Amino acid sequence: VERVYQKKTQLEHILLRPDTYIGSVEPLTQFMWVYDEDVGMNCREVTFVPGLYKIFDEILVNAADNKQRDKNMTCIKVSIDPESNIISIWNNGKGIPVVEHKVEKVYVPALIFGQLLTSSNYDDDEKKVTGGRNGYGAKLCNIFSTKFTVETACKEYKHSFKQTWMNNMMKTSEAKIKHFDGEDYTCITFQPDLSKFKMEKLDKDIVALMTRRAYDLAGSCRGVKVMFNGKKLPVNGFRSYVDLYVKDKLDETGVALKVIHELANERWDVCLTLSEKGFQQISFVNSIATTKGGRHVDYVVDQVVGKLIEVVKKKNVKPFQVKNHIWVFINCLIENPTFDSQTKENMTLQPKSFGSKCQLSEKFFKAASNCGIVESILN
Amino acid sequence: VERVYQKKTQLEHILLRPDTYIGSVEPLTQFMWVYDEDVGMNCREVTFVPGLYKIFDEILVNAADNKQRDKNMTCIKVSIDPESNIISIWNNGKGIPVVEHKVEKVYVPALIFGQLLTSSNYDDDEKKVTGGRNGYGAKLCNIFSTKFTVETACKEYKHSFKQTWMNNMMKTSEAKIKHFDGEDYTCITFQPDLSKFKMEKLDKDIVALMTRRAYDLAGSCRGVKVMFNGKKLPVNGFRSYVDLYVKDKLDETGVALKVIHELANERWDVCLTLSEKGFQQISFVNSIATTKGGRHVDYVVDQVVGKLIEVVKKKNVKPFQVKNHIWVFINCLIENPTFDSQTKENMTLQPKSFGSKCQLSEKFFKAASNCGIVESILN
Ligand SMILES: Nc1ncnc2c1ncn2[C@@H]1O[C@H](COP(=O)(O)OP(=O)(O)NP(=O)(O)O)[C@@H](O)[C@H]1O
Ligand SMILES: Nc1ncnc2c1ncn2[C@@H]1O[C@H](COP(=O)(O)OP(=O)(O)NP(=O)(O)O)[C@@H](O)[C@H]1O
Ligand SMILES: [Mg+2]
Ligand SMILES: [Mg+2]
């Protein structure tokens, strides 16, 4: 009875059932986009552990989210040392208040990095476009790290704070609190617990995925510069990011891909071209990589599929056949987005709730008509 | 500081962020398979709340899971009264021990239906093929119900137990404990909290989805009979279930769909036919509807795509083009399956971990050659 029927603590449950929190802790092999030291941006077969990619992603999106707390933020700095097994993500703009929380009686940084279900994103009356929603991400990286360090400096509270966790968030010690006068920042430094992922080292494949995610951020997070291992990424907006995929590329007819672009408004940036590999989508919601898509992709793609069916009808086909020929790129800001998992690969919020619209122009639909999709359908 | 940075309890978090536990609590409109009072099995546009479908599904899969605790189980009885807003799922086979848990000091049924993170599925050394993994499902139905009743009778412990929860698992009272001599059963009776889903009533669309799920169970759960509203479902195994989709159907050439079947072994039952609507999959893992697919679908479909590429090559194409023409049906039993969410729509366990193989026969691949897929590709 006592061995059959068991209760678990929340902390036990995360280590026993990591998949619902961070994705699979087993290897996956699949074709995907990565940023390699030899070829840069390329689609190749990759072997990696999603859980390890995800704990990195949780800290990267948290940096991107600071651009919403402080629009004066200009910089995110990512560093990965496979030899030392140390990852750091640094951001400027406002730091975290270095002060005792009057309800929980702990330093605010210790509360929100060292206790589960803690967030500044729990009040949905504020209609934020942060990626953060659930109050898990940072603690999940902590739990899946042999060492996890939080360094934040907050001019307002005129202190700096540095606290270190170890052994899967099971050990800490007193925060170092100091006088601070200067330029706000937060720096998260962690050594991922590679034993949790049955890995010996951050190999080339995981480093290539984490590097690409740093490019995604440069493309997705408006007005923020990104450095990777001390070097500025040469991406200055979503259009330059999309170029990394399509600028140097030919259809299998030997004609350059025709890339169509519309910034419908501040919250919706769309590129479209021809796919010869079936439906492809590269999408971001609040700087989250929505790698399974969701309602934002369908909302944009249905408008295009609509207008392209018309054009084809009127020069001599079914939605799924048109979509088969679409490569779409979407950078969007959604108020209070919803997802079916902590991993946020699929965004489930209905379009009427987005807080904005993407009504693509007749100009955009005319250009879509010319980009080679119509011709393939006809052919 | 105290309003910006907040901590939530696990119970608060489930109501604040229901999407990661039960799926969207907002309406969704999409084409799907349902079982209607007028046409039976059919694909039509449906408007429903995934969260309400899911709390029903959690109790249905729990009944299916009892066939693993007691292989003598023969019967699941589902009843839905939209007028009274009462759903009941009854099963036979072994009941739940009616006895005080010696660690948690509560009746075992009160522990596992009234406290979060409680399960008989937390020991993965047992290599089970239950759908249950996380210790949430029943509590989530409880939390999303105005009234939730647990009735179980356990001959071994010679007692029956009946306890009622109300107001989102926030109220209960003493269990009724009685002498019991007879035939074991469990009956879960709940009134879903329709205000949580912005609904007035269990309408036709949600009832049609819940009804279809009762057909899925009759198809998926080997050696268990299913009744819906007091009437036995005329499905006696997976092949009869697949017939509900394809038996009375023509390709758009006016030729009957050719349906190929192999029971590779006790744990793998596969049907294949032609799709004219792009890739389609209907799959079950341990009686869970894996509506987003996962590694089990890819494992089966890659073998077929492989052998069909060969056949085409040798009578005058790319994987995605072959898959475009496949309608696959899969009923499988996977040891300790993993998923990216509590909703279990996508099964992420790698095939080397399944605990079994599905090596489809040359006989099956020859029949696949003849079922119209090759001809469409060629054409
Ligand atoms: N770089 C940062 N700068 C400022 N505040 C931060 C930073 N990283 C984390 N935070 C704060 O710490 C909180 C906890 O982060 P986290 O655990 O990732 O939760 P979240 O981002 O709110 N939600 P989620 O990521 O969906 O689980 C956030 O709500 C922020 O208030
Ligand atoms: N019909 C039933 N008959 C017998 N035992 C049951 C029944 N329904 C639930 N249980 C038991 O109650 C426990 C709690 O159910 P539940 O909360 O759904 O968790 P789970 O099925 O173990 N995991 P999950 O459904 O993934 O969250 C199960 O582990 C079973 O031991
Ligand atoms: Mg976060
Ligand atoms: Mg369950």
Residue numbers in the entry:
A (entry chain A), B (entry chain A): 46 to 361, 367 to 429
List sentences quoted exactly from the publication behind this structure:
The final TOP2B:AMPPNP model contains residues 46–429 and was refined to a Rwork factor of 19.2% and an Rfree of 23.2%. The adenine ring of AMPPNP is held in place through direct hydrogen bonding with the carbonyl of N136, and stabilization of the ribose sugar is achieved via hydrogen bonding to the hydroxyl group of S165. Hydrogen bonds are made to the α and β phosphate groups of AMPPNP by the side chains of residues N107 and K184, and S164 and N166 respectively. The side chains of Q392 and K394 from the QTK loop of the transducer domain hold the γ phosphate firmly in place, with the switch lysine, K394, forming a salt bridge that is believed to stabilize the transition state of the hydrolysis reaction. The γ phosphate also forms an additional four hydrogen bonds with the main chain of residues R178, N179, Y181, and G182. The catalytic Mg2+ ion is coordinated by a conserved asparagine residue (N107), all three phosphates of AMPPNP, and two water molecules, one of which becomes activated by the catalytic glutamate residue (E103). The key catalytic residue in TOP2B, E103, forms a hydrogen bond to one of the two water molecules coordinated to Mg2+, which activates the water to allow nucleophilic attack on the γ phosphate of ATP. Our data show that the ATPase domain of human TOP2B in complex with AMPPNP is in the restrained conformation with the nucleotide-binding site sequestered from solvent.
Human topoisomerase II beta (TOP2B) modulates DNA topology using energy from ATP hydrolysis. The N-terminal half of the ATPase domain contains the ATP-binding site and is directly involved in clamp closure, undergoing dimerization upon ATP binding. The C-terminal half of the ATPase domain forms the transducer domain, which connects the ATPase domain to the enzyme core (Oestergaard et al., 2004). A heart-shaped dimer is formed with a central cavity that is 31 Å high and 23 Å wide, the dimensions of which cannot easily accommodate a DNA duplex. Each TOP2B ATPase protomer folds into two discrete structural modules: the N-terminal GHKL domain and the C-terminal transducer domain (colored yellow and orange respectively in Figure 2A).
